[PDB]
């Protein structure tokens, strides 16, 4: 059991630095579609779902407040994944500490390749 | 963007009040302000341009009245 007799805090309006969130690793299995699904849309074969290794996914993080995006989405640099999706990348968000409203949320969407030039979401989370 | 008719007293509202009134925002110290400026500078200009086109059409019609 740790200890801390004093709580040190700062008002979000007083921290004049950008808010950074590091998208770490995505742990878990992404389910493959049936062959009938590949028959319905042949482009599915060329999708990242059909790469045997962990596809090189990236997460675009955009801050929303009251449903309106505060800034443009920031994307993780391309990284080649072998056995695990581990980005370990500190993302510099386009939102400053004083500019975040109380109801501010970060939406992170993981995207994979879906044929030539088309990205399809693998899945999303909002915190 | 909702202004569809320009009152006679505001024909020069854009060059002297709208555009000069927000011009200081394009250089604001707060990045959120400059961001709001960059996000809207394109819209503000397009809105002023719509106003100028309406004033010109109205002037052409008033000259033909």
From Swiss-Prot, chain A:
Domain C2 PI3K-type: 35-127
PTM characteristics: Ubiquitinated via 'Lys-29'- and 'Lys-48'-linked ubiquitination by UBE3C, promoting its degradation. Deubiquitination by ZRANB1/TRABID promotes its stabilization, leading to autophagosome maturation.
Domain of life, per lineage: Eukaryota
Localization terms from the record: Midbody; Late endosome; Cytoplasmic vesicle, Autophagosome
Tissue specificity field: Ubiquitously expressed, with a highest expression in skeletal muscle.
UniProt function note: Catalytic subunit of the PI3K complex that mediates formation of phosphatidylinositol 3-phosphate; different complex forms are believed to play a role in multiple membrane trafficking pathways: PI3KC3-C1 is involved in initiation of autophagosomes and PI3KC3-C2 in maturation of autophagosomes and endocytosis. As part of PI3KC3-C1, promotes endoplasmic reticulum membrane curvature formation prior to vesicle budding. Involved in regulation of degradative endocytic trafficking and required for the abscission step in cytokinesis, probably in the context of PI3KC3-C2.
Family membership: Belongs to the PI3/PI4-kinase family.
Subunit structure: Component of the PI3K (PI3KC3/PI3K-III/class III phosphatidylinositol 3-kinase) complex the core of which is composed of the catalytic subunit PIK3C3, the regulatory subunit PIK3R4 and BECN1 associating with additional regulatory/auxiliary subunits to form alternative complex forms. Alternative complex forms containing a fourth regulatory subunit in a mutually exclusive manner are: the PI3K complex I (PI3KC3-C1) containing ATG14, and the PI3K complex II (PI3KC3-C2) containing UVRAG.
Protein name: Phosphatidylinositol 3-kinase catalytic subunit type 3
Gene that specifies this protein: PIK3C3
Span within the parent record: 1 to 127 of 887
Swiss-Prot record, chain B:
Tissues of expression: Ubiquitously expressed.
HEAT repeats: 13-50
Organism expressing this protein natively: Homo sapiens
Domain of life: Eukaryota
Protein name: Phosphoinositide 3-kinase regulatory subunit 4
Record note on modification: Myristoylated.
Function: Regulatory subunit of the PI3K complex that mediates formation of phosphatidylinositol 3-phosphate; different complex forms are believed to play a role in multiple membrane trafficking pathways: PI3KC3-C1 is involved in initiation of autophagosomes and PI3KC3-C2 in maturation of autophagosomes and endocytosis. Involved in regulation of degradative endocytic trafficking and cytokinesis, probably in the context of PI3KC3-C2.
Family from the record: Belongs to the protein kinase superfamily. Ser/Thr protein kinase family.
Range of the intact protein held here: 446 to 510 of 1358
Subunit-level organization: Component of the PI3K (PI3KC3/PI3K-III/class III phosphatidylinositol 3-kinase) complex the core of which is composed of the catalytic subunit PIK3C3, the regulatory subunit PIK3R4 and BECN1 associating with additional regulatory/auxiliary subunits to form alternative complex forms. Alternative complex forms containing a fourth regulatory subunit in a mutually exclusive manner are PI3K complex I (PI3KC3-C1) containing ATG14, and PI3K complex II (PI3KC3-C2) containing UVRAG.
Location of this chain's protein in the cell: Late endosome; Cytoplasmic vesicle, Autophagosome; Membrane
């Amino acid at each position: 059991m740790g200890e801390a007799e004093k709580f040190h805090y700062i008002y979000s309006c007083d921290l004049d630095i950008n808010v950074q969130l590091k998208i770490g690793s995505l742990e878990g299995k992404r389910e493959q579609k049936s062959y009938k699904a590949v028959l319905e849309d042949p482009m599915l074969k060329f999708s990242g779902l059909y790469q045997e290794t962990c596809s090189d996914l990236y997460v675009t993080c955009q801050v929303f407040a009251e449903g309106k995006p505060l800034a443009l989405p920031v994307r993780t640099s391309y990284k080649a994944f072998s056995t695990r999706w581990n980005w370990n990348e500190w993302l510099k968000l386009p939102v400053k500490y004083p500019d975040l409203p109380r109801n501010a949320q970060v939406a992170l969407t993981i995207w994979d390749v879906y044929g030539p030039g088309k990205a399809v979401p693998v899945g999303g989370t909002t915190v | 963007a909702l202004v569809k008719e320009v009152p006679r007293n505001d024909i020069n509202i854009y060059p002297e009040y709208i555009l000069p009134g927000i011009a200081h925002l394009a250089q604001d110290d707060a990045t959120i302000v400059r961001l709001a400026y960059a996000e809207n500078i394109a819209l503000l200009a397009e809105t002023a341009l719509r106003f100028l086109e309406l004033v010109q059409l109205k002037n052409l019609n008033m000259e033909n009245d």
